[PDB]
Amino acid sequence: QGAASSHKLAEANTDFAFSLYRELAKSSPDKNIFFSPVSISSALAMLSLGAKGDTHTQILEGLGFNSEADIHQGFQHLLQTLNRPKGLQLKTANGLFVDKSLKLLDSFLEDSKKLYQAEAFSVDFDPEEAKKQINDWVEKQTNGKIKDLLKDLDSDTVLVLVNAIYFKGKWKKPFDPENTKEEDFHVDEKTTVKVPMMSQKGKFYYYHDDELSCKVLELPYKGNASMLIILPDEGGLQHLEQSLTPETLSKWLKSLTRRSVELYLPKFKIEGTYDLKEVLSNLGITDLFSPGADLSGITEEKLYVSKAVHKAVLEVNEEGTSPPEFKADRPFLFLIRENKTGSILFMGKVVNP
Template sequence: ALLHTFVFPTFQQYLKCTETLYHAELEAVDFRNALEETRKKINTWVEEQTSGKIKELFTEGILGSNTVLVLVNAIYFKGKWTSEFKKEDTKERPFRLNKNQTKNVQMMFQNGYYNLAIIEEPEIQVLELPYGNEEGGELSMFIFLPKDIKDNSTGLEQLDSALIYKKFVEWTTMTKMHKQNVNVYLPRFKMQESYDLGETLQAMGMLDVFDPSKADLSGMNGNRNLAVSKAIHKSYVDVNEEGTAAAAATGVTTIFTSSGMPCVFKADHPFLFLIKNNVTKSILFYGQCTSP
């Protein structure tokens, strides 16, 4: 990720920190007299950093002439599966949107040995699909698939209510996951979303920084005359046979035996997914697929 800063006069210490800690570039622009040109310039930088996947991060009207600072963080990830899905095995199959509705999707398939966990509470399967040339590499996608749809919801409500970061970490550790012979069914999917995170961050307790009377960002310029006005996030994820392009416990684990028929992991109903760095344990992207 690269932090790109379009700024007004600031403390040298702050600028040094952004450069040292975030490898940030610094560029001065004119929000007052060239607002539209500046907006397009920032959007062009984001588009270039994400290989054209994220366009128009800032739409018209988001920035104003009273804007004095924009911090932009852009990350682009493109990974190939360690074991790619064969395109000839992709077939049109039904995907259950909820208990009563289905749609036909392009469902990928392959058989192989994958790390799999079965969690009893809540009832889910957790599958690891690694990226890179070797098993046990740095990056993986983890898919959290509810056992079934229990009512007219998407099936994710019960899982969402049970999830905290601690459980994410626990369910995706190698002590919980075991390599199994698995028939994997996974739909192709592509999604792009844009979010205004202001209300979300304030609901999480980040209040003062959005309030001009309380915000204290004096570490940037020595004055308490700054406040955050907008927090915009835009994401893009494309999952196919080759891999992924992306531009964000209680219960007992049951171990399958290696004998007999392969386990079946069939993502034919809504699921959660995340892309995780297995070395740092950090989550790079997280989302849910409810309608491929």
């Protein structure tokens, strides 16, 4: 239909981010969430290079696109824009591991390299030595921050998708460590957890959303990205999540004003690990992850995605470079977005810091 616009990309991806948050939140409640919805969108987009028929349809439509949409040069442009050196410098592992007895079409290897900067490997799939080789590659690609990604590996495995990312960003406005004090984080009515509370009093873009009974605060990162922290009022989190949509976000963006805030933010490390087959099953991307998948653009041989893992890790600390109180001493949501593109890089929920 002609390559889709950057604006189409920004809209399809952002609706995919939120819909994916909403499924994760419904699936595993009361657990820490952290994923990179743009990493996932890109990996599915990459795989769609080699998908045909309903397999191809289910991917695009699940990504937020018309069935006949042409998305590749748009994704290519978006990615090179995120990966600019004035960016976050996210080192990420994105690998495709396929049975070595299968001959891969050249058009796929070239097109996934150039467009998506994604690496494909033909591999012998002995359950043990293969998991070693793959986990070791992710380790290298992520500078050792993500070890042992794969837990186990079935002998009849034909195709493994691996998507891993570790993020530790630098604040535009850094907390002074001297202000950091142990405080109670109230996980729920009956659970308390002791946490280093970072504190800072300054000017931040802030909004108190009465409609949704939550506060919203923006923390700028070094590298033209920002964390939007959403703190619900007492006993409101679930309703806040139900009302968590692209239209709410933009409403929040127009509504933030630069205000003097007293800010209390815990230093924390969270993690998400996801099986893309069960996570995407409700988003309607099913055929791809089962024996009758049409991946005849990848190989003429019968083929499907046997295993697909996304893992994302986030460290938050103090480094480095009437008034309202924003005290995050109970579960809260956040997302990290790219300023230039509006891209939702990460989304998360801190329940157990």
